[PDB]
Amino acid sequence: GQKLKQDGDSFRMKLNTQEIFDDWARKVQQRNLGVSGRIFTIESTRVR
């Protein structure tokens, strides 16, 4: 029983989830997504 419980606890620790949430939030902050600016943009492209 204790062997089973420690196997389950170790698997659950390996099964943690908040780290990915923190990483995604950090990436969102680093990239700093936004929409503020012009209504639409006109740009330059040399279409083949």
Partner: peptide, 28 residues
């Protein structure tokens, strides 16, 4: 005095309008 149709509707090719609006967006 038979009147003739005046200047017709122009095309104003999209490229010219687009570049003019590039300029306007640049200076705004």
């Amino acid at each position: 005095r038979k009147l003739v149709h005046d200047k017709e509707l122009a095309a104003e090719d999209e490229q010219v309008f687009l570049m003019k609006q590039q300029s306007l967006l640049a200076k705004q």
